[PDB]
Amino acid sequence: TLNPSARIMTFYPTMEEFRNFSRYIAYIESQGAHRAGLAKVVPPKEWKPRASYDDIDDLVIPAPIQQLVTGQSGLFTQYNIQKKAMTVREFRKIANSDKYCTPRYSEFEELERKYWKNLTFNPPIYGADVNGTLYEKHVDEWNIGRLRTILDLVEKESGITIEGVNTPYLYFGMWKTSFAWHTEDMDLYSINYLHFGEPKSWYSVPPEHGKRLERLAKGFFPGSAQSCEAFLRHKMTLISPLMLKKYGIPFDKVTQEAGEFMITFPYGYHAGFNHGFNCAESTNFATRRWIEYGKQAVLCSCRVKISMDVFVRKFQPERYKLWKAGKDNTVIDHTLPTPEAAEFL
Numbered sequence: 001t002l003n004p005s006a007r008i009m010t011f012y013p014t015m016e017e018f019r020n021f022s023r024y025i026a027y028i029e030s031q032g033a034h035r036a037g038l039a040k041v042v043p044p045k046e047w048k049p050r051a052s053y054d055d056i057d058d059l060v061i062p063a064p065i066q067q068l069v070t071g072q073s074g075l076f077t078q079y080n081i082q083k084k085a086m087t088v089r090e091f092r093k094i095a096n097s098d099k100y101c102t103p104r105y106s107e108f109e110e111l112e113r114k115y116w117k118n119l120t121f122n123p124p125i126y127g128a129d130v131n132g133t134l135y136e137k138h139v140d141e142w143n144i145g146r147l148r149t150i151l152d153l154v155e156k157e158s159g160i161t162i163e164g165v166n167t168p169y170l171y172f173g174m175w176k177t178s179f180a181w182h183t184e185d186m187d188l189y190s191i192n193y194l195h196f197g198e199p200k201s202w203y204s205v206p207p208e209h210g211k212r213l214e215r216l217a218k219g220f221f222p223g224s225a226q227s228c229e230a231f232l233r234h235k236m237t238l239i240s241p242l243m244l245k246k247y248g249i250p251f252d253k254v255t256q257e258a259g260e261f262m263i264t265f266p267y268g269y270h271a272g273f274n275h276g277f278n279c280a281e282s283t284n285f286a287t288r289r290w291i292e293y294g295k296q297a298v299l300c301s302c303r304v305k306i307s308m309d310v311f312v313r314k315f316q317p318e319r320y321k322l323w324k325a326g327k328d329n330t331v332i333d334h335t336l337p338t339p340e341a342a343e344f345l
């Protein structure tokens with residue numbers, strides 16, 4: 001529970017360290033960041049992915065979703081109602097209005113209590129999964145739109161576009177909008193940058209304890225678990241930090257403020273909520289460590305699947321026959337950093 005090996009680390013790279021994305025990820029894994037499932041990276045003060053955000057009031061959010069939550073005793077299920085399209089302007093009006101705005105709070109822990117006490121009431125609207133990017137064309141460091149990781153093999157060799165995985169998504173938040181407990185698609189890494197506005201709070205379970213979270217949820221949602229062997233992948237399940245403490249799931253929390261990146265690691269369960277009107281940009285990425293997580297990922301069996309053949313042939317040609325036949329049973333040690341990190345010791 002308390003073990004700092006599994007606690008969320010924050011990093012403050014210099015501009016020189018920053019310019020190389022894949023290398024900095026390898027560095028933060030050399031320092032154990034991946035054990036927590038989530039890390040924060042504050043960029044160098046000077047760096048700026050856009051001049052300013054005054055000029056986006058006419059951006060269209062095609063499919064805003066109202067987030068209806070049902071439940072009690074810290075277990076909840078989140079349903080989506082697609083609303084018809086609206087602009088950033090229309091969205092900010094609702095968000096900053098008096099029916100939807102951030103309540104009064106002295107500190108994080110007060111706002112958290114109000115979140116878990118009030119998430120079933122007063123359903124907010126989330127401008128989620130908007131295709132696009134808010135970086136200017138000219139930004140070369142940590143550009144969510146083009147990160148140059150090996151994930152690029154899906155598009156380059158397989159010729160496949162997957163929206164929000166291979167491509168960036170924007171998220172327009174408002175108080176009490178939520179992301180439920182999940183790992184990424186195919187258990188990829190993710191990157192999330194908060195462009196502006198109020199903060200985003202995150203909960204994280206270390207990858208070494210993720211199966212504990214799955215067994216908690218199977219047990220609390222037996223119906224869901226019979227229908228689909230990865231029902232968390234549906235992104236409808238909210239579980240409170242008080243339930244996690246109560247059943248001995250270790251977890252950590254952290255708050256992302258405007259201008260910060262969050263990195264999620266393979267098989268890092270995460271959830272959270274936005275404090276008020278904000279905008280984030282995110283996509284998935286991979287390292288060589290990801291490949292084993294990809295091969296082994298348990299997928300939604302009832303409704304994103306990436307073909308691993310390209311990755312195994314390119315990076316594990318020795319193991320390919322064995323893997324195709326069903327014989328490869330490498331076991332993942334979640335503690336080990338990516339091979340790319342050998343240069344740091």
Ligand SMILES: O=C(O)c1ccnc(-n2nccc2-c2cccc(O)c2)c1
Pocket residue numbers: 128129171178179180183184185190192200235270280
């Ligand atoms: O909306 C977020 O702030 C957020 C944060 C972290 N991860 C997610 N992810 N990651 C993959 C897919 C989602 C996602 C996307 C849309 C709604 C949702 O509840 C979750 C979304």
Ligand code: NI
Pocket residue numbers: 182183184190264270
């Ligand atoms: Ni995520």
Ligand SMILES: [Zn+2]
Pocket residue numbers: 227228229230231234300301302303
């Ligand atoms: Zn399913």
